[PDB]
Amino acid sequence: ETLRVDPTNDRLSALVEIYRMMRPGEPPTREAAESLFENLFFSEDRYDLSAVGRMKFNRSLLREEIEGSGILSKDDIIDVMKKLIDIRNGKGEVDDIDHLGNRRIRSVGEMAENQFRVGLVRVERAVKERLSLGDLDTLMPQDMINAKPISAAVKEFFGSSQLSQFMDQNNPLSEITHKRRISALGPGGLTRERAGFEVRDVHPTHYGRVCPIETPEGPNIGLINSLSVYAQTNEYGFLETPYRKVTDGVVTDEIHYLSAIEEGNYVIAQANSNLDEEGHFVEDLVTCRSKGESSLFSRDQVDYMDVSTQQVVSVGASLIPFLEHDDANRALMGANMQRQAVPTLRADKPLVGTGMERAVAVDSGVTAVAKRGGVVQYVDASRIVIKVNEDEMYPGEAGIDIYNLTKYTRSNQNTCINQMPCVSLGEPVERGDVLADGPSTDLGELALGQNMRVAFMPWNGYNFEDSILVSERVVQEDRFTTIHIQELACVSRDTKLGPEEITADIPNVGEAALSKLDESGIVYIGAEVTGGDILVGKVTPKGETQLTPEEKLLRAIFGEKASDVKDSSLRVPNGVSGTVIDVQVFTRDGVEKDKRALEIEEMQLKQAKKDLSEELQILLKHEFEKKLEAKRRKITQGDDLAPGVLKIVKVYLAVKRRIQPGDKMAGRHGNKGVISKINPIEDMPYDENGTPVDIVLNPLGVPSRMNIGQILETHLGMAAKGIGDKINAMLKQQQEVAKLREFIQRAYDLGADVRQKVDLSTFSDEEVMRLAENLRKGMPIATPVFDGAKEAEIKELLKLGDLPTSGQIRLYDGRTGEQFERPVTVGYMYMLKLNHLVDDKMHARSTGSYSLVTQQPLGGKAQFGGQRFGEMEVWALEAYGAAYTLQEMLTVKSDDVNGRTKMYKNIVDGNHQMEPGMPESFNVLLKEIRSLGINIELEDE
Amino acid sequence: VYSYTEKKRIRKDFGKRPQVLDVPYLLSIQLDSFQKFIEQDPEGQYGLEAAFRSVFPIQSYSGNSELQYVSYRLGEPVFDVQECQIRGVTYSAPLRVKLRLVIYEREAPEGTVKDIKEQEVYMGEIPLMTDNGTFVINGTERVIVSQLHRSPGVFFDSDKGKTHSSGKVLYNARIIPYRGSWLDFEFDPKDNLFVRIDRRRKLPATIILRALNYTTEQILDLF
């Protein structure tokens, strides 16, 4: 029937028909049509199924050759048509587009290679065109090729592309979870606007390859998936996950990485399956999943078993203790939130973790890890020096390692990156040991927040919907305080009226305002500035001011002169108040350096010599001196700045944000919350011992959203702290080594058969005391994701300490001293400070700058702009009778140019009346419709 | 066995399933990909070598003057990572490619060449990956996120009866390359097979068959 409807009769007619389809209007011709068809699919230059493409093509056609060619053939096309026909009638299955055996993974190397090849083709075009006229001795292979296209392509990819983004750096976990992030968007993928639900949905093939919960909720949900903990990538780019091979009945320890399409062909046992100490399943019927579904299978039926119970989740999802007790929505929220925790002043530790904190802390290069074992030779806040053990020493070298710690620097999110040593002098360290603690890390453990004594009770509406009541002791201990380094640049350019200057002479500012600036006009280092103070003093030349009358007169009266320079000094933003910790000066090559630039340069040169000289002293002389001349030349070489800009001064401010109502806190279980009140320590609930609770959380938050993990986390949290408290006592009275060893050993055993064994007998008395001192703040506990601590074990640990196993104590009102009825749940919960500080979100405006084409206020808080009173707000005003409110909102407060100045004046003299007028945007619309050939006018003028 | 930094403070461990495979390096996905891109292998499989081999050799149309690629190397970065962050620059390595311009003597189909000009030339600066999977591009640390995209090959994706009344299933095949145009086959409700190229106007499928130098008789012989 296709032939019946087919209009063509010969090959040339078909070629011209497809030519008319491809290039309508262009008359079809023999040679052109032939070339077009031969270039579509059968020319290697303009068509390529990659090796993976050929492999998938040959697999889908049931061929037995995994390799082949990159261009299509007659056989390939005809076989595709034949299989389509077979699917139409025979037994054919629609391919699942969302199958992870059908979706490939592209990484940075591949995409960069593709864009480099794009640059190469667009340089070869020029190379060929130039070669069109071959020469003998006038051209070289340096003039036929231009680097600009290749550089432009590479820079366009790496700088301005959807798949290359600013690195989320407010956390170790945020960095690590950004680096292993999968996105279906970008050039070659879908679009968030028209992706479609089916692609967003979780697939049974995501199991162990793509996390089911770690994904952003919003416009692009299910399109920004994150890689699972154990997931890998094929040579071809398909995600594969590990499994332990099962013989007849023995679970072997050999690991096979199975891809999605291979996963169906076997039945895979669960990680929550038992083994009788020899590899055999205890139960004769085990739960498996064969093809999408799961069922029970005989012991002698399974080919594979899950490598671990953690392998379904991502790294962030696998840091949530008691995840299995949390609703999937709330777990999604919890992972997303803990990606946003701000590093506080002192990283505490998770008192209740999952055991994945060490992996995240070390794998992300936020700490300093020993490259080679040895004995610590010198420790300082800024560096560590290791004397390598001779076993790891290479013959031709000095066995010394110098780790230079990153001191207070700025992250992409304006947080504080700072590395502190975590070792003492003369201590033995082995390869892979943590030597310094980066931001939000405690002895190599990821420490995103603080473990706080929380009580679950209402307390007077101060935690009403999700609000949080916080004690003043929490603020006093500065345990949710953060450092927020920020850059501020003053750039002096070359203007037409004259070059800009960074002098310290600034008109219309008194002696005191310029006290913080040195002679060269730049603030001092360490100076505590306030919102409004000058940082860099700058002045721009100006002329032909065109003074008005009754101002010429005033200047004449006071014998004053109008300055020929206007003030353009860099001032501290209003509200911000920190200390100046760093100043950088970038001077153009030709310009002459100022006093402060020269002073900075000498400090950098001496520092450079000091670092190089110390390196040689600690540890070669030829490389030392050669590097000193290179380092010296780099320090004074002069900076390649933008065109016109004469000199750049960057000032780094260091703020300290403590805590306040409006700051968003969160636990790891999706329990959000904004601090509402900060309470005096004598107003907080307290227990029989007079110890107040740090935070009070509403218990009505828990039941509606089934995140029970937090409650569990609280109980275990209490239990953990309990152990520490006991240890604390045994350390305040110098009891003995034996008693501490016995109690700590008893605390590590705890009943149920746990895979972890700790024998304190091999711990020397000195080591046991160090362990006890590290455990006096609480006993850290690991509760793996789906293999956590059972409730009975929590009760047993609560019993080891003298805490009740119900998890609830009787609390008293600090206000009245009366016992709260109905004992309340108190414990320790890991609270995080999220990067949603009310410092950065409060914003107000009376009048300010206005938009250019439409005479309306501007955007939010960076241009000091106003709030959008959108269309739905207008509807709300209309539904009320508020017609004067609405009119003033859309005429005098926004758009009427003459109206808003009159309103400002009228308010100034206490006459709260307006002359509304016509908004300027309607005038713009009238001129725009008239700018088409449409005559629109106002009647009855 | 307890490492020194873990002997200081041991985390009590619940959980009963023994560990058989430890967590891999968490940043392998980025580091391995960029290593394969930047490192040069003695094969055209991966990276800049693959790109050069795939397109860099060039022949002057009707002139038979050739420009061929020998090897490449990455020059030392001018600045370190920290200096790039401070000044504001892309942590990049220069790309120096060895090229050879071979000139063929006129009327030499055998391959006799006049001369060869072998010179090393500069082809842009490629941004480098720091030790932790990041790129500093203009002094700011950037991350390139891996993309999950439809794999090349043939896919059969009949609609679910959402097109025509009675919910008839119209089957289709689609060839997706890495580079090139798309080639779709589809069915209409009247049970006819139609070819479509780069998602343009529909055509009867047999047209493509005729375009491949097939007659009606052998077409029916095939199908």
Place this chain on the structure above:
Amino acid sequence: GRTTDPVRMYMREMGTVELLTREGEIDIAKRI
């Protein structure tokens, strides 16, 4: 078929005239 591309229409209209024959340009200059 049909197209809206102005460049395609220009190509259509201009390509109709045969390019030239040597000694034809000389005769055209002669006519000028």
